[PDB]
Amino acid sequence: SADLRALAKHLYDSYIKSFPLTKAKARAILTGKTTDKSPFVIYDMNSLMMGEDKIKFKHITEVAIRIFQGCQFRSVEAVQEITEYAKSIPGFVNLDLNDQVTLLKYGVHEIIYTMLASLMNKDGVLISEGQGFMTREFLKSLRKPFGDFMEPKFEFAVKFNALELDDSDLAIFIAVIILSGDRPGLLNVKPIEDIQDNLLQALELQLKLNHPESSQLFAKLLQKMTDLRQIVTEHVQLLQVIKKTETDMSLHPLLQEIYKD
Amino acid sequence: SADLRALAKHLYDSYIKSFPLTKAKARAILTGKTTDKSPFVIYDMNSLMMGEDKIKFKHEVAIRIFQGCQFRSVEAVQEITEYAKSIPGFVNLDLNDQVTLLKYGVHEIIYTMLASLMNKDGVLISEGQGFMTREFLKSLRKPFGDFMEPKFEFAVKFNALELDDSDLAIFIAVIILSGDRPGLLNVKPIEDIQDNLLQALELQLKLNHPESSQLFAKLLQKMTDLRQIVTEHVQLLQVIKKTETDMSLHPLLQEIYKD
Ligand SMILES: Cc1c(C)n(Cc2ccc(Cl)c(O[C@H](C)C(=O)O)c2)c2ccc(C(=O)N[C@H](C)c3ccc(C(C)(C)C)cc3)cc12
Numbered sequence: 015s016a017d018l019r020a021l022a023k024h025l026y027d028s029y030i031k032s033f034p035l036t037k038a039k040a041r042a043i044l045t046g047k048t049t050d051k052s053p054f055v056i057y058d059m060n061s062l063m064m065g066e067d068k069i070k071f072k073h074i075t076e077v078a079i080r081i082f083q084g085c086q087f088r089s090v091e092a093v094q095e096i097t098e099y100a101k102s103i104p105g106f107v108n109l110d111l112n113d114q115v116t117l118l119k120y121g122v123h124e125i126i127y128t129m130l131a132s133l134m135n136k137d138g139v140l141i142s143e144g145q146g147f148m149t150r151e152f153l154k155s156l157r158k159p160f161g162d163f164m165e166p167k168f169e170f171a172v173k174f175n176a177l178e179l180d181d182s183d184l185a186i187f188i189a190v191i192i193l194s195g196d197r198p199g200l201l202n203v204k205p206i207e208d209i210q211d212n213l214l215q216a217l218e219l220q221l222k223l224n225h226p227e228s229s230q231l232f233a234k235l236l237q238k239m240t241d242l243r244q245i246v247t248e249h250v251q252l253l254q255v256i257k258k259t260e261t262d263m264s265l266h267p268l269l270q271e272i273y274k275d
Numbered sequence: 276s277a278d279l280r281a282l283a284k285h286l287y288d289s290y291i292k293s294f295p296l297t298k299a300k301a302r303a304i305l306t307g308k309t310t311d312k313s314p315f316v317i318y319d320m321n322s323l324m325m326g327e328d329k330i331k332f333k334h335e336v337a338i339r340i341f342q343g344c345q346f347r348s349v350e351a352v353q354e355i356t357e358y359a360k361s362i363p364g365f366v367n368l369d370l371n372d373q374v375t376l377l378k379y380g381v382h383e384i385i386y387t388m389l390a391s392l393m394n395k396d397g398v399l400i401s402e403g404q405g406f407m408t409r410e411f412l413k414s415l416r417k418p419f420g421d422f423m424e425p426k427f428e429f430a431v432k433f434n435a436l437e438l439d440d441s442d443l444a445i446f447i448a449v450i451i452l453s454g455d456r457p458g459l460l461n462v463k464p465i466e467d468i469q470d471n472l473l474q475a476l477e478l479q480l481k482l483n484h485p486e487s488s489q490l491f492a493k494l495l496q497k498m499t500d501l502r503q504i505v506t507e508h509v510q511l512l513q514v515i516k517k518t519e520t521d522m523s524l525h526p527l528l529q530e531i532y533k534d
């Protein structure tokens with residue numbers, strides 16, 4: 015039980031270090047103060063063109079494309095954040111290297127949607143590391159197939175953010191997603207599930223000591239893993255339609271090499 | 276706590292009352308126990324066509340097998356419907372909500388209970404008196420050949436938890452009482468009923484499986500594997516309705532597929 019506190023704090027610390035924009039920092043920005051500087055708001059086409067001028071995005075080499083490709087940049091950015099984090103989970107580095115890769119290959123989408131929930135409200139999502147805020151309505155207004163890209167993630171974020179999880183809770187949750195013993199292609203599932211049994215224990219205790227008035231929060235949190243998986247499925251189906259019916263490229267074939275799987 | 280033991284006992288009795296073929300019965304048939312009579316195995320044609328003699332058909336071949344397979348499915352929708360009414364609070368909800376909860380829950384319940392009738396080599400049929408092999412089903416002409424295999428793949432993973440009926444009774448309740456279903460008017464009274472069911476399920480597993488860590492959590496993550504075979508199955512329904520348009524889908528099952 016103290017061992018489990020050690021694990022929960024350890025992961026909280028790794029999560030702080032590995033991820034720039036935490037849920038507290040992001041919640042702050044999304045709702046009035048802490049009133050340092052408001053974010054640039056993109057709400058419509060014209061506010062976008064000024065947003066590229068002002069904020070200055072790292073991914074600028076249409077329009078519904080250019081945003082789609084910002085997500086990809088940021089996703090690939092995030093994957094390295096997630097990989098460094100995975101390496102701090104007790105036992106992860108000592109697993110077979112083939113298993114490590116597999117776990118990350120399948121975990122990362124699910125983890126990206128989880129931490130994206132942290133950056134969203136009902137009305138939009140923080141971009142450029144907190145400097146910006148793109149409206150939900152604007153994203154739903156983009157043409158097919160791009161109008162329906164972001165919406166399944168907002169629908170999710172609304173339900174997930176209602177659980178009112180802290181970063182100390184998310185940190186453990188993230189480690190549980192990564193260590194799923196049912197990913198296709200794993201060679202040695204035993205030690206994976208051992209580690210996950212420990213993370214789940216720690217999550218259940220964390221969840222009790224931190225939210226003792228919210229009954230069965232543990233069970234409700236594990237039920238959202240269903241909703242996570244269904245978003246990765248709805249998203250693979252969309253990448254299908256893009257690679258099928260879009261000149262989603264030109265390209266530097268060296269770019270689409272970077273942004274494949 | 277005592278009240279959760281009480282809810283658990285109540286739901287177990289409604290399970291036994293509403294389902295003719297329990298897991299425990301299934302398991303006794305599948306092994307070699309003297310409590311139950313060994314099944315007639317069907318592993319190809321002639322075995323099928325000799326199984327016509329030792330019974331039954333339902334009450335071409337891939338058509339005749341899958342038409343009856345749907346008949347047993349309506350019956351199961353009836354058995355599940357009757358079980359659901361026993362769950363404290365369910366019948367007190369909005370009527371619209373009662374149907375929504377069944378519309379999305381039945382498939383998840385059917386495939387959970389179908390696991391009880393299965394091991395890796397095949398599946399119990401005709402109330403336990405036949406057994407049809409996995410390879411035989413897999414040899415059937417496409418698209419029906421690939422119909423049963425996801426079910427087998429889930430079942431083998433799920434039967435690994437070694438749950439028994441007193442555990443399934445509660446779990447099946449939790450499935451039906453999910454507040455995250457499309458088109459529900461008042462989620463909140465549903466979420467409260469589910470909150471009790473999980474509390475009850477938690478205790479039930481800790482008492483009935485004291486040596487197996489995080490079975491509460493391992494079990495709940497299997498709902499992700501169920502949702503997946505439901506979505507895989509409607510994809511396959513679309514294809515069946517176009518290739519073999521000679522085949523009738525029962526209206527109760529018509530209404531359920533619109534999601
Ligand atoms: C991390 C992330 C964020 C912050 N957003 C919102 C968002 C919305 C719009 C823009 Cl222009 C954007 O980029 C800006 C410039 C930024 O954050 O700096 C970000 C996202 C929007 C969508 C996604 C997303 O769906 N990523 C999926 C999981 C994804 C897609 C494709 C890949 C591969 C590797 C296959 C290319 C991985 C992951 C991820 C994110």
Ligand SMILES: Cc1c(C)n(Cc2ccc(Cl)c(O[C@H](C)C(=O)O)c2)c2ccc(C(=O)N[C@H](C)c3ccc(C(C)(C)C)cc3)cc12
Pocket residue numbers: 331332333334340341342343344345347348351385389392398399400401402407512515523524528
């Ligand atoms: C409850 C159930 C059982 C016990 N099985 C195994 C099985 C396999 C084969 C037969 Cl012939 C069978 O029926 C016998 C006669 C019986 O009475 O038990 C049952 C099943 C196999 C499949 C399914 C299932 O997926 N049913 C869905 C609702 C379904 C949808 C659509 C169709 C068609 C092909 C008609 C479009 C069938 C079934 C359900 C079951």
